């Protein structure tokens, strides 16, 4: 595989990431959309797809010295290190099933389950823009996208 996908923040050689720490509530996989809640705990979003004003908050992969990878789920009830995405960076998202990415530059909406999808940019908040031409069939595949 010439496109190795073992780091969820691949967005330039001079751009550092912005980290939002917090507590866990469930066991999600790295690369999914999050939403902070009451107390100081983070979990999956579970908001509607047609709701604006959400912050671009994805789950960073955990450190190598804590048993973390791009497919290892997080341990519940602990400190999950996340990423707030600035506009103009590339990040590996995680799409849903049965959608093909044909052109580099389509709009990336947010599904209600914590994954992303190609939606019409007239009724949902556009988070990012596609940057890789692949076709996915299993829910949970990593697709490169630019956050602008």
């Amino acid at each position: 595989m010439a496109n190795s996908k073992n780091s969820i923040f691949v967005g330039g050689a001079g751009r550092v990431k912005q980290t939002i720490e917090g507590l866990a509530q469930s066991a999600f996989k790295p690369g999914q959309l999050l939403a902070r809640a009451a107390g100081d705990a983070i979990d999956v979003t579970a908001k509607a797809s047609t709701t604006y004003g959400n912050e671009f908050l994805i789950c960073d992969d955990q450190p190598q010295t804590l048993g973390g990878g791009t497919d290892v789920a997080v341990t519940a009830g602990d400190t999950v290190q996340a990423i707030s995405v600035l506009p103009g960076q590339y990040v590996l998202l995680s799409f849903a099933a049965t959608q093909n990415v044909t052109t580099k530059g389509a709009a990336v909406a947010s599904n209600g389950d914590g994954n992303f999808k190609l939606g019409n940019p007239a009724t949902e908040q556009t988070f990012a823009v596609t940057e890789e031409i692949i076709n996915v069939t299993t829910a949970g595949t990593l697709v490169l996208c630019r956050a602008i």
Partner: protein, 50 residues
């Protein structure tokens, strides 16, 4: 008048486990409080023949 300065306290901190959570800055304001310096004096004296 001897006006002296009295600055404030400052600082917002933030805790983390990874340590990279956008360290955040502050400074100090100021205000002044003044006093006054008057002059006291006194004298004494006798005559010549005494």
């Amino acid at each position: 008048v001897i006006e002296s300065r009295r600055y404030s306290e400052a600082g917002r901190i933030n805790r983390s486990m990874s340590g990279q959570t956008d360290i955040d800055m502050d400074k100090t304001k100021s205000s002044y409080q003044k006093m006054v310096i008057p002059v006291f004096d006194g004298a004494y004296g006798r005559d010549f023949r005494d």
